[PDB]
Symmetry: C2
Subunit: 346 residues, 2 copies
């Protein structure tokens, strides 16, 4: 189950599963922020049962994988290089790569830069955004600079959460005061039930300005934790045992490495200029969430999927669920993945 | 056994043990670099059996305790403030504090700044060095600036390991390539058997220049790992199960927080100027190691112990053991601690 891979000097921890014959196409699962290989707990058994060799890693800076302090260790191409190291560890020429949240940009970019090593790519929550890394209502494919675009058009005297994350000072401070409660807050808030309830509190305008006056949008000097919402009772899809797992991983790893991902966005947008225009050629698929903020912000990037991905095999919207897509709708997600992989050849 | 304390916003994890009545003087154990509460595994049961409430914490940046990225979170007074939070969690007016390696400066400084909360202090490996934090053959009490004093007088075109550690770039890179082997290397190298063997390779000069041409002294552009020595077989005091524990803690925590300790030395020396002169008044004790580099470098600070500590209850030298003092000589160390605590009143 547990494996330690050496990806050209970087220790990458992973949880594997496959048919007893130890044969089948390789499927790599990339988790996002602030998650773990554990986020794919409902897919691993399904994919392995369908005949695939499934590998769910802890990205660098997470769980039991290498923890770097320097910022350059968390640039998109380093993340991508880790995925390449995974395939190399399994001696696999190609592999299906599935990424969620931050895992998606890495999976998308992995397919963009290494189409020869990719049999298919699936981004969950966050649609392909080219050099944009993360598509937003204003810039679906990174038309403008990430940082500055955040500043203006995102809040008068407010702060874009991503830029807050990138600071890695106050964000960490508000987390450590009570890490377990922070995880619960951030989870329930951008979840389905949490979003439906936040909307139910209607008491409809332009989406581009809905971000402001939103949770991920805070007033300068405040704390992102200030806008969280906690459930009266632990949702059925995210129990106490799940929260205890995640809590245990992060009280050991911290958020330093994870937050450096956000800190390098501008740097990623930079590193990916020499790719704009070039299409993403592997067969691609996007799974979005009705109430997921990732799906909503990349709405413009999704309408133009075929414009950037010739082998785009389609968009799939899961209703009533929020950001934690593969956990909130484990079986719907499994069906979609099994269909996509099923109709493709390794 | 395991406890999670809230030290004024900082999560401090600890392993406790005490008489069933849950009464007895409080004894706080502070580990060093790159260690864990686990380093005191042989003392915990002994101290608890002698009637003491023993608390062995993971310092911030370690194990399951809060992980900060900003450098100021790792300044001496922050570390000291954590110890104060520990006593406060147990509602203890006073406590005996025992620290090893990096744990010693924190214990010494804790006694220096909060004599009213300290019933006694014991530094192991690293003798009290005042604003010096870590006493060296040249500067026993921080007479000169730490950083610059490192540069000159420590190697022509060489590098002082502490300044290397402080960089937190290449040091971490050489660690992550193979973390488990790095721990073994660093451990065996500065251990007793490792030092005796390194000396046995005689084929005696001034100590102040023995540092150079030494393990902790590397040539610019090289890697500290380049000078390590590995054992043919795991020493009897540091087995594979021990190495597996430590390996597991650090592959999860990383070395970022830990190395920030070294990075802040100059800053500590600065923060502690307003203390020079003032004596350390709690009853104090130092346990050194014949082959321990900490004991050797602070040789000048130990000869002048009574000059800075009026209640200095004595120096104790354990022979044949190296730097990992309480693990290499668990019972000798227990006797010394039990004698010191035994003759004092909580």
């Amino acid at each position: 189950v547990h494996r330690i891979l050496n990806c050209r000097g970087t220790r990458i921890h992973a949880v594997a599963d496959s048919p007893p014959d130890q044969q089948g196409p390789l499927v790599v699962l990339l988790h996002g922020f602030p998650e773990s290989w554990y986020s794919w707990r409902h897919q691993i058994p399904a994919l392995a049962g369908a005949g695939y060799r499934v590998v769910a890693i802890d990205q660098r800076g997470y769980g039991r994988s290498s923890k770097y302090r320097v910022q350059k260790a968390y640039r998109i191409k380093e993340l991508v290089g880790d995925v390449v190291g995974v395939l190399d560890s399994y001696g696999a020429e190609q592999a299906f790569v599935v990424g969620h949240d931050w895992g998606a940009p890495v999976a998308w970019t992995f397919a963009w830069l290494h189409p020869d090593r990719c049999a298919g790519v699936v981004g969950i929550s966050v649609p392909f955004a080219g050099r944009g890394v993360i598509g937003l209502p204003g810039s679906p494919f990174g038309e403008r600079r990430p940082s500055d675009y955040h500043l203006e058009l995102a809040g008068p005297g407010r702060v874009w959460y991503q830029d807050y994350f990138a600071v890695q000072d106050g964000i960490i401070t508000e987390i450590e005061e009570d890490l377990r409660g922070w995880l619960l807050g951030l989870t329930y808030t951008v979840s389905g039930e949490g979003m439906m309830a936040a909307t139910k509190a209607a008491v409809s305008m332009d989406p581009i300005d809905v971000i402001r006056a939103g949770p991920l949008c805070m007033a300068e000097g405040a704390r992102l934790k200030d806008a969280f919402v906690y459930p009266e009772t632990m949702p059925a899809w995210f129990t106490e045992a799940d929260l205890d797992f995640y809590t245990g991983e992060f009280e050991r790893s911290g958020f330093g490495g994870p937050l450096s991902f956000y800190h390098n966005i501008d740097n990623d947008w930079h590193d990916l200029a020499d790719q704009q225009g070039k299409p993403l050629t592997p067969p691609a698929l996007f799974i979005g969430g009705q109430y997921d903020v990732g799906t909503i912000w990349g709405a413009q990037a999704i309408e133009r999927a075929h414009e950037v991905m010739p082998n785009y095999r389609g968009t799939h919207m899961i209703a009533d669920v929020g950001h934690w897509i593969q956990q909130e709708a484990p079986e719907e997600t499994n069906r979609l993945l099994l269909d996509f992989l099923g109709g493709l050849r390794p």
